[PDB]
Amino acid sequence: GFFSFIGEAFQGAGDMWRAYTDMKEAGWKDGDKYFHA
Amino acid sequence: GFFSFIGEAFQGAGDMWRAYTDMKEAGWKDGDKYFHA
Amino acid sequence: GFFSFIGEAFQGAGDMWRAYTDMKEAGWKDGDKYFHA
Amino acid sequence: GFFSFIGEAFQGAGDMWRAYTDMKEAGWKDGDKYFHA
Amino acid sequence: GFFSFIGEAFQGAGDMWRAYTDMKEAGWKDGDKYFHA
Amino acid sequence: GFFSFIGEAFQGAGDMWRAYTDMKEAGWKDGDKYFHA
Amino acid sequence: GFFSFIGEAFQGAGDMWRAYTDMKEAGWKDGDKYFHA
Amino acid sequence: GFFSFIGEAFQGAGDMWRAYTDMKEAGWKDGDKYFHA
Amino acid sequence: GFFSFIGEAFQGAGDMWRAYTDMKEAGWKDGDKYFHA
Amino acid sequence: GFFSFIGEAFQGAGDMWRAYTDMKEAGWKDGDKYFHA
Amino acid sequence: GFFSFIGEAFQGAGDMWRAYTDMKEAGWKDGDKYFHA
Amino acid sequence: GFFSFIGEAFQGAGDMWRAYTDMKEAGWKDGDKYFHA
């Protein structure tokens, strides 16, 4: 894949550029994400 | 794939540029996402 | 695929540029998303 | 595919540019999405 | 496919530019979407 | 296909630019959509 | 697309089931094909 | 796409089931193909 | 894509099930193919 | 992609199940292929 | 990608299941392939 | 990727299950391959 980003990126809560690869018989659990202003 | 982004990107809560690949017999669970202003 | 974006992108709660690929015997669960203003 | 976007994009709750590809014997579940103003 | 968009796009709750491709023996479930103003 | 859009697009609840392609033995379910003003 | 072939297919010289997809700013050149009997 | 082939396929010289995908600023050159009997 | 082949496939000289994907600023050159009987 | 092959496959000279992926500023050269009987 | 092969595969000279991936500023050269019977 | 092979595979001269990955500023050269019977 190809991606070109120019400028600003904002994230309050969470993940950025996560790459999970080549898994077998795996499990996981992600929590909740909250944003308050 | 090809993507070109110029400018600003805003996310309050969640994931950006997530890439899950090559999985077998996998499982997972993502939580809830909240935004308040 | 090809995509060209120029300007601003806003997301209160959720995912952006998610790419799930090459899965076998997989499962998952995404939560709810809330926006309040 | 080809897409050209110029200007602003707004999303209160949900996903943007989701790409699910090459799946076999897969399952998942997405939650509800709420918008309040 | 080819698409050219110039201007503003607004979504209260839901998905934008979703691309599901190359699936076999798959299943999923999307939730409800609410808009209040 | 070819599409040219100039101006504004508004959606209260639902999907925009959804592209489902190359499916075999698939199933899914979409929820209800509500708009209140 | 959908195709169902039952029987024999013969080709002396050339390509079969060629699929070129999603190209931008591309070029190529194919040669000549000869058949003698 | 969908294809179902039952029987025999013969090729003297060339390619079968070629799939070129997602290219940008690419170039190539294929040679000649000869068949003699 | 989907393909189902049942039976025999013969190739004297060349490629089978070639898959070139996700290229940028690439070049190559293929040679000639000869068949004699 | 999906492919199902049942039976025999014969190749005198060349490649089978070649997969080139994710290349940038690349070059190469393939030779000639000969078949004699 | 997904592939299912049942039966026999014969190659006189060349490569099988070649996978080149994630290259930048690369070059190479493959030789000729001969088959005699 | 996913591959399932059941049966026999024959190669006279060449490579099988070659996997080249994550290269930068690389070069190489492969020789010729001959088959005689």
Residue numbers in the entry:
A (entry chain A), B (entry chain C), C (entry chain E), D (entry chain G), E (entry chain I), F (entry chain K), ...: 1 to 37
The article reads:
SAA1.1 is an acute phase protein that becomes strongly upregulated during inflammation. Chronic inflammatory conditions, such as tuberculosis, leprosy and rheumatoid arthritis, are risk factors for the development of systemic AA amyloidosis. We report three cryo-EM structures of SAA1.1-derived amyloid fibrils: one that was extracted from the diseased murine tissue and two that were formed from murine SAA1.1 protein in vitro. In vitro and ex vivo fibrils possess parallel cross-β sheets but differ in their overall topologies and fibril protein folds.
This fibril corresponds to 75% of the fibrils present in solution and is considerably thinner than the other analyzed fibril morphology, termed here morphology ii. Cryo-EM reconstructions achieved spatial resolutions of 2.73 Å for morphology i and 2.95 Å for morphology ii. A single PF consists of two structurally equal stacks of fibril proteins that are arranged such that residues Gly1 and Phe2 from one stack interact with residues Asp22-Lys24 in the other stack. The Gly1 α-amino group is in the vicinity of the Asp22 side chain, while Phe2 inserts into a small pocket formed by Asp22-Lys24 main chain and side chain atoms. The ordered core of the in vitro fibrils is considerably smaller and formed by residues 1-37. The in vitro fibril contains seven β-strands (β1 to β7) at residues Phe2-Ile6, Glu8-Gln11, Asp15-Met16, Arg18-Thr21, Met23-Lys24, Ala26-Asp30, and Asp32-His36. Residues 1–37 form two partially overlapping arches (Gly1-Thr21 and Gly12-His36), reminiscent of the ex vivo fibril.
